[PDB]
A paper describes a structure:
E-cadherin is a cell–cell adhesion protein (1–5) that forms adherens junctions between epithelial cells. E-cadherin is a Type I classical cadherin, with five extracellular cadherin (EC) repeat domains with calcium binding sites between each, followed by a linker region, a single-pass alpha helical transmembrane domain, and a cytoplasmic tail complexed with ⍺-, β-, and p120-catenin linking the cadherin to the cytoskeleton. The stable final form of the trans interaction is thought to be mediated by the “strand-swap” dimer, named because it is mediated by the N-terminal beta strand in EC1 participating in a domain swap with the similar strand in the opposing cadherin EC1 (22, 32–35). The initial encounter complex during adhesive bond formation is thought to be via an intermediate in the monomer to strand-swap dimer transition, known as the X-dimer.
Activating Fab 66E8 was crystallized with the hEC1–2 fragment, and the X-ray crystal structure 19A11 Fab bound to hEC1–2 was determined in a collaborative paper. The crystal structure of 66E8 Fab, another activating antibody, bound to hEC1–2, suggests that the bound Fab would cause a complete steric clash with X-dimer formation. Although the affinity of 66E8 is weaker than 19A11 at ∼100 nM, it still surpasses that of cadherin dimers. Thus, it appears that two different activating antibodies structurally interfere with the X-dimer. The only significant conformational change in EC1 between the linear strand-swap and S-dimer is a symmetric inward shift of the first four N-terminal residues (DWVI) of both monomers, with the shift most notable in the Trp2 residue. In fact, although hEC1–5/19A11 shows by far the most pronounced inward shift in known E-cadherin strand-swap structures, the crystal structure hEC1–2 bound to another activating Fab, 66E8, also exhibits this inward N-terminal shift, as well as the aforementioned bend at the Ca2+ site. However, one possibility is that activating Fabs act by obstructing the reverse reaction from strand-swap to X-dimer after the strand-swap adhesive dimer has already formed, impeding adhesive bond dissociation. This is the most likely explanation for the 66E8 activating antibody, which has a large steric clash with X-dimer, and would be consistent with the model of adherens junction dissociation via the X-dimer proposed by Hong et al.. 19A11 Fab binds the back side of EC1 including residues close to the Glu11 hinge point; 66E8 and 59D2 bind in the calcium binding region, all consistent with this model.
Residue numbers in the entry:
A (entry chain H): 20 to 148, 154 to 235
B (entry chain L): 20 to 229
C (entry chain C): 102 to 181, 186 to 314
The structure:
Amino acid sequence: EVQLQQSGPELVKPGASVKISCKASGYSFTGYFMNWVKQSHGKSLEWIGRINPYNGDTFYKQRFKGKATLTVDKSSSTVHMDLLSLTSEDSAVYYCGRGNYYFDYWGQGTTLTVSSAKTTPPSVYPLAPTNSMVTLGCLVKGYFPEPVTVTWNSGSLSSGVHTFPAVLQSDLYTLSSSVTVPSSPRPSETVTCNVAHPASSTKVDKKIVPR
Amino acid sequence: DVQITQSPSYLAASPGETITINCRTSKNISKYLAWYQEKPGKTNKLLIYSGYTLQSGIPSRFSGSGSGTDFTLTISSLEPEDFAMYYCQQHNEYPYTFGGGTKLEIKRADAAPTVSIFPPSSEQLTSGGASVVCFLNNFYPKDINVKWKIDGSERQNGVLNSWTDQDSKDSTYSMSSTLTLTKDEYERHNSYTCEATHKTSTSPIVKSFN
Amino acid sequence: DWVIPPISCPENEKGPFPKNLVQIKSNKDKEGKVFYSITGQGADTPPVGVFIIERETGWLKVTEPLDRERIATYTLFSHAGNAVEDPMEILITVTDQNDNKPEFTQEVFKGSVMEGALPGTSVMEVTATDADDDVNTYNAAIAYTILSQDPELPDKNMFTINRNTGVISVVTTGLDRESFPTYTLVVQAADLQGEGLSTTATAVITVTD
Ligand SMILES: [Ca+2]
Ligand SMILES: [Ca+2]
Ligand SMILES: [Ca+2]
């Protein structure tokens, strides 16, 4: 089984450089060219260039000369891509793919985020409410190191949940989550959202109490 | 460079139907076009290469045609797995280039959005901020518009919107809207309203706070 | 004798159509009006409509893109309540664009070489064809290259391939069957003398006794 395994996500300030790696297995490494493809958020796929692993021979798309450097390490069946003088426009998902022409196998992609913002913990704010179904939520605002994880009642209550993709507001991310329960003549149960934010070591619970 | 126009961008269908996706190229590339499928959490999947050659592991209800400048991917008897993103790529010449993509979404009965409005919390108002949040949940189709009206007056500044993809369990869409002001700019007014305009109602659905 | 020369029209032309090619005239239009029409493949006999004319002016037009690899040349006949002139032979030549890639005659080529063969020993031949005009352009001028060799022992380059003929030869001593009994080469054929469109294939070389 062919497998292209890429290195983990990169978060770097502008002006810096990163090297993204992609390790191949399951086939004779030097038999196929390796490729790198860029995909910006919402945008389409863009081919950056290729390298012949047998001899390091490269070919670049014109607009990436001086932005991207492709290298190979045969002893470890790994291809590397250097990205130099990074800008916010470089923020994207980058894919490696096997093939001299079409790409019959792809890596899972590497996410590059280019930003000058500092690691910031999120502020969590309740969103309290009557129809037979009732919607509750909580707002996750003002964090930078993506991502966060929102669970309701420690994951026991999971259906009826809508965790919305974050939005970049002044170099910081804001996210909201909503949960709907069909609360009834019984006294409305307590409900708390559990916001996990790894990169700041932040585990926070905010209980939603109706006004 | 070979430019590719891939149409349509979006396409809604039901299991069992047959759909087509088209790529037109700016140069005659003979047969050397390939089709790929994209799905979250999965590596991209080659379906057809060289115009009409079915890749190993792909069922024959995927078929390709064309040569020169006009190419078509055809998917007969759609299965639920087939609802995904699709890309063509010419592998004729450097630099390789891709079509803009096609999102194949699943047809579903029209649904009105359940909309809820929320005033800023006690904590946020102590921090000095005031974000009023509006949820528009489980509607279909995805086309929807939100106007914010602060005391009957429309405001387009400070609004941030966020959309989910089509839900996997019930095929609906949801949207979140957030107007952001500060206690100074906030408490000058009394009523705040989001109103949603959608296919399912001739008059917008309105939810207000005081 | 003054005749209309062959009209050349490139294939794969873009819009808009119709596109003018040549105008034909009969000086018998001096006395009275003349009606023009053309016959032949591309106008009359199949294919149909590719070449047309407007009877009032005599403008021979083309209405859709051409493909040299299907129809390389057309031959039409121009005409003029009575016939005015004996028909005129109008030859149309489709000029070539590099729109086809070289293809190897097969995906995998088998070959064998004797262990200890001296450098220069012919091993095998790979072959590709290009469907473009190889007499008036370079769009079918194929150069062969080796893209990779597996394994890379005793040496990284045990073999060479001739740019023009596709013959693969030994360049290094040391072929040993008990050591490395098979070599796999990825071979490439590119047109425009090696600078243009390419495809690949595989050469599998067995080392014998
Ligand atoms: Ca042609
Ligand atoms: Ca041609
Ligand atoms: Ca050619």
